[PDB]
Amino acid sequence: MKEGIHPKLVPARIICGCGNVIETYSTKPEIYVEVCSKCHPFYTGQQRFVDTEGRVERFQRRYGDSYRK
């Protein structure tokens, strides 16, 4: 290591947007996170989020009938 121009590597606590205490190292000691691996939709399985099957559209709109045959 050409020490004299490189930043420190202090042990970093990382409190995330889920109560996570992600134990690792970093340049900044106390950094907080919005989302991590532990709660992202495209990370932990297929998940759901808001999107279920794309609105009521379109062959399943329902809200009407007039057939009995």
């Binding site: 947007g17 907080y32 989020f49 808001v50 999107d51 794309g54």
Partner: peptide, 25 residues
Amino acid sequence: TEAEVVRLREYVENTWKLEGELRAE
């Protein structure tokens, strides 16, 4: 406060479509 923040954080993310996700539809 971060207490107020984290509660409202996920509430709106999960309720409706937003950003590129909304844009997508």
